[PDB]
Amino acid sequence: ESYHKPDQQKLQALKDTANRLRISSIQATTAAGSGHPTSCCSAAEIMAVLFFHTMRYKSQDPRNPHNDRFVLSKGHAAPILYAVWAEAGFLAEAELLNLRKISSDLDGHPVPKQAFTDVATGSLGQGLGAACGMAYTGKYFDKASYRVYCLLGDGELSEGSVWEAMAFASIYKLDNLVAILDINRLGQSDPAPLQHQMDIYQKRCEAFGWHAIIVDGHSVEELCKAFGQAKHQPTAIIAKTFKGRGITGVEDKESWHGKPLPKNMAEQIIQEIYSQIQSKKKILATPPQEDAPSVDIANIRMPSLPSYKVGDKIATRKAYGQALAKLGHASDRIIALDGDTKNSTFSEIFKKEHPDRFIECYIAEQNMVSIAVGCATRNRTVPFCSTFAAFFTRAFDQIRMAAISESNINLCGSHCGVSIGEDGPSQMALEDLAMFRSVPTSTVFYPSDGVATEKAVELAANTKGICFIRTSRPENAIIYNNNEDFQVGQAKVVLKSKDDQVTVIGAGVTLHEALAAAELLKKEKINIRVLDPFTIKPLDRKLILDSARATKGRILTVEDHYYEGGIGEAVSSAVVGEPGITVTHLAVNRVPRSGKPAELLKMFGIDRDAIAQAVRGLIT
Amino acid sequence: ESYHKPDQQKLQALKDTANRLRISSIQATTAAGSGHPTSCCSAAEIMAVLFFHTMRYKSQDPRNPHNDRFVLSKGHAAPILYAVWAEAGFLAEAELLNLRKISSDLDGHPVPKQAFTDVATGSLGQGLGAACGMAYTGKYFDKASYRVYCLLGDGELSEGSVWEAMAFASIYKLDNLVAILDINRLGQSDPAPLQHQMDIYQKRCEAFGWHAIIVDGHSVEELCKAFGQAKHQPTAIIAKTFKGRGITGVEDKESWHGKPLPKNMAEQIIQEIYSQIQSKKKILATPPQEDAPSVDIANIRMPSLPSYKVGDKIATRKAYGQALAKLGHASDRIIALDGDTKNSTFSEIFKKEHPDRFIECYIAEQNMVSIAVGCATRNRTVPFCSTFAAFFTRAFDQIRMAAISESNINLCGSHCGVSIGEDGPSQMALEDLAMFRSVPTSTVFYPSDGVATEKAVELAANTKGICFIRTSRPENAIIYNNNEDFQVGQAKVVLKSKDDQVTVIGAGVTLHEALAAAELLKKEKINIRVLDPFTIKPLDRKLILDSARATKGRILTVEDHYYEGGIGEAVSSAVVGEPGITVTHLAVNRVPRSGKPAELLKMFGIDRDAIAQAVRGLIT
Ligand SMILES: CC1=C(CCOP(=O)(O)OP(=O)(O)O)S/C(=C(/O)CO)N1Cc1cnc(C)nc1N
Ligand SMILES: CC1=C(CCOP(=O)(O)OP(=O)(O)O)S/C(=C(/O)CO)N1Cc1cnc(C)nc1N
Ligand SMILES: O=C[C@H](O)CO
Ligand SMILES: O=C[C@H](O)CO
Ligand SMILES: [Ca+2]
Ligand SMILES: [Ca+2]
């Protein structure tokens, strides 16, 4: 636990290691013909000191739950990440030369198919948020001794998501977290705004609550000392470096970002760098203290059935909070995150019952998603984050990268559609189905009553990938019995007869408007089938087609969402070309406006009267 | 012009005005049954001083180009915005009571159907970026004397987009910009992280380069004085306020965000506030100096036809930069913005030729979009912002709000799809068609060669709404004659014969793969029709169906995009139910990986061999 103050031999070995890391970064990117060697070279001493002096980890078990965590937020320096894991003996040295090949897993940016990578990076400014999740988990959930280190670029610090993470770490006193800023003066296409004004970086980090240390980022001794001292708050090591450090004629120059060295130049430069290496002997990693606890990864089952009764009124946003609090008694791994909307999403119910597992993320949706991704790494927790569904559009790049990170997180977005009424369109989610359907690992739950909501929470907890649950503001009636069985990809026919003339597909508020339309139409001797998809992705194609073939081939979809990328388009894409099938589509055709929920459902053509009129037009 | 130091009577009139604004905010939200009176009341002295001492504007012409700008970033305080414009005499006082009604345009959050609103707010943290665009336009494009004032909440300051804007304003020395921070201690569901630690707010603003003044936010005199001194930096007025100020029993209390007062309570409170008002006499607005220049509104035309030659190879990303620079020579209204990717998007070509109209936005996509929106307000410029298409997912909420703002901005996203090759999925746009198609005011151009790209740039410049141009990395052949006419919503058949067996729809790289598949299939005596959509939204439904009817009803769509929300789903939704029509869909089915462009097109089943295989299977 004491700092091991290095002797001159250890320091020289760390210098030798940094220069081996430079050589490998050049060799690999020259072999591939693409990549970012100058972005690797500015970080070589940082990487050497982190992996061969400061960090504690099992070199043959990178995912080990007791290990210190390292997050390469500037993911385009991937070649030097691969180099340190070869230096540590986990990766074969020859495999480094296969960088970016389709036959290799040493891809252009780090990805979790690599045992030594927890989260994919490559979209800049997201790594510190994931690191914050890891550090929060280590400090407050695992209560373990591992530390979390996150390496960022200086151009990267222009992303606002970075400063959300900065503020989060000081709010939650993440003294097990270290951010290393590679201040190499240059971005991709020009100098970074602050260049080498190290004092301004220090002032910005200190103002956001971090202990900020300016170092020479090419001095292994200064780095050892800065990493070695006792942290009392999150610590920023602000490293003055030169891009392309060690590449004569390229160091500190523009026009070299993302440019590999040609073969002839690489050979010449590598010879120069090799001439600076005093010994070929490698430093061994040091293993960690093994005090992370065991976690139960068994299937998660609710402690009881839903306790609703058919006919009761409840909004699915309220049923979400009730179900999430219940799920917290079913599993110690459930955590909840919310962005200052807990009284609107009803995640406050979970907070009241399991306060130690609720994370207030404040008005910072991008960081909230990144925190959840970090908390889910190494399967330590099962996160549920919530806000208005409209404000998950603020975090789309984090959600996109979460799928590239093969992350298992759960997202519940409330206040979907025009049915929220008077707040108007800034608060109305009308594109969230399009957004989440386009996320490749996603399961999109759209529960239509309190029972389906509780069942969706339970299923989501046990489902891999990006799970989205779309909840609603109107109080609608319970239509399912408490022992109704639900499955991902299985729809429900909630009204049927042998004389059905259309299959009407609705969800949430428009399922209840479709049931109301069915009652109106029965007064004119017109029966319609009503189908509740339950999951919009994956869609129950078979039940939709079987239903349509029983209703003259006619499908009518109605949704509180824009036309593009929603339920209607999913249904059309599923059935196109099937003989005799037709699909009519009712949705929201433009930016809405303020009014009462029923007034807006009418104005935008997705209420019971619009459904009934569409049905009549189909019959004639 | 000299500061007019107000006498005690002017100060009392400002207090009277602030209290009238309180009363109206309460009356309107109690009448509506919803809204945020406590969020209005903390800002009442700020609003009174801004509109009736500091700002200069035409009270009867809120959109006038010489006016100072006000941006209500904390948009849920809309009732007090409406109240000031009634106090200034633009809005009928009686209409305030119709807040949030479907019969009114005084909607729950501000929207540009209101003459006094430039940008919609309601999604927190976006107003300051729009204000930065307005102030940049005022200082460097209009070169006018108007100033820009932006009111933010304190919970709102947790959004990273705010700090991107803070940094932008100090980089570009926006000394015509003032941010007012309503530090009323409380957010929606808890105190804001910093509560009333005014010194930490000051340190954060100063560290980001702003002149920061702490004031008593309920002192009209301190506010007059703080607003009355211009600076050489953007200026942050950090106002210590109490939420619900002036509402006895509610001031400084939790559990009141977004809660209207019940009628009995509102009547009692209003009588208390009215007893503090010394005179009914209203202050008059003071008009501005009229030095904003005229701006032309005419159609913008390229100075000449494209000058490519059929058979030449150019990537559409390079054609974009060439076309944008060319268009810059025809109209001085064109401005370009980029997020440190100008050497990759080729917006660097525009920077080289028109440096005064290029805005480097650094690695901050959310702010870049907001800057563009701000620059486009009052039609002052025609902005084109660019980055990798994948990183526009970082700005989806800003793009969403831009459509609610009825903004005319142009966005070009490069590096779409797996065809970028070795960088891997973090850089691959595979959901951008889904995202932009879901934006209700959007036109989505997907040019397949350099000619189409230049035509798309010209069309986009003259098209209202959110225009997206998807560009690509591969260097594909010019296929169109320079004099080919292009229109929004009109596709092109680029290969046909009388014996065509399938209509293959591709775009960008998959159009060229389709053309290569056609050559492979001709060896097998199989002709295919090949169709280039040009715009994905709106889709040329008629040409698609006419083509399909000439090819035995068979359509095959192939796209470098995920399955959901892209070209295939757009086509399927357009043609579903049409007799005899079938649609086969080839797209990317999961998160990709690194490899050569051609290897990834093959791996993910969208190359010439996958297309030919699908055609051979259809014909059987
Ligand atoms: C602009 C940019 C880079 C420059 C980073 O400069 P830096 O100072 O943070 O790091 P180094 O100087 O250490 O290189 S790396 C890069 C890529 O596309 C490659 O991922 N991009 C485009 C990019 C833009 N926006 C986002 C969100 N992610 C990105 N990866
Ligand atoms: C959390 C939140 C508000 C609290 C604002 O606190 P503040 O301190 O900035 O302002 P005041 O204290 O001055 O009210 S107003 C609000 C709404 O949905 C209403 O638009 N929301 C949800 C919200 C969440 N995220 C975003 C991006 N926008 C939002 N509007
Ligand atoms: O009351 C409902 C509001 O929409 C959020 O609490
Ligand atoms: O060509 C290399 C990168 O893709 C951008 O220029
Ligand atoms: Ca840099
Ligand atoms: Ca506040």
UniProtKB/Swiss-Prot annotation, chains A, B:
User: Is Magnesium among the key words of this record?
Assistant: yes
Give all Phosphotyrosine modified positions.
Y274
Keywords from the named record: Acetylation, Calcium, Disease variant, Dwarfism, Isopeptide bond, Magnesium, Metal-binding, Phosphoprotein, Thiamine pyrophosphate, Transferase, Ubl conjugation
Q: What do the Gene Ontology cellular component annotations say?
A: cytosol; endoplasmic reticulum membrane; extracellular exosome; nuclear body; nucleoplasm; peroxisome; vesicle
Cofactor info, note text: Binds 1 Mg(2+) ion per subunit. Can also utilize other divalent metal cations, such as Ca(2+), Mn(2+) and Co(2+).
Which cofactors does it use? Answer: Mg(2+); Ca(2+); Mn(2+); Co(2+)
Q: Which residues carry this modification: N6-acetyllysine?
A: K5, K10, K143, K203, K231, K240, K259, K537, K602
Modification sites for Phosphoserine: S2, S103, S294, S344
Record-annotated residues binding Mg(2+)?
D154, N184, L186
Per the UniProt record, the site (Important for catalytic activity) maps to H36, H257
* InterPro entries documented for this protein: THDP-binding (IPR029061), Transketo_C/PFOR_II (IPR009014), Transketolase-like (IPR051424), Transketolase-like_Pyr-bd (IPR005475), Transketolase_BS (IPR020826), Transketolase_C (IPR033248), Transketolase_CS (IPR049557), Transketolase_N (IPR005474)
Annotated SMART domains: Transket_pyr (SM00861)
According to its UniProt entry, the function of this protein is described as: Catalyzes the transfer of a two-carbon ketol group from a ketose donor to an aldose acceptor, via a covalent intermediate with the cofactor thiamine pyrophosphate.
Family the entry assigns? Belongs to the transketolase family.
What pathology is it implicated in?
A: Short stature, developmental delay, and congenital heart defects: An autosomal recessive syndrome characterized by short stature, developmental delay, intellectual disability and congenital heart defects including ventricular septal defect, atrial septal defect and patent foramen ovale. Cataract and uveitis are observed in some patients.
Know the name of this protein?
Transketolase
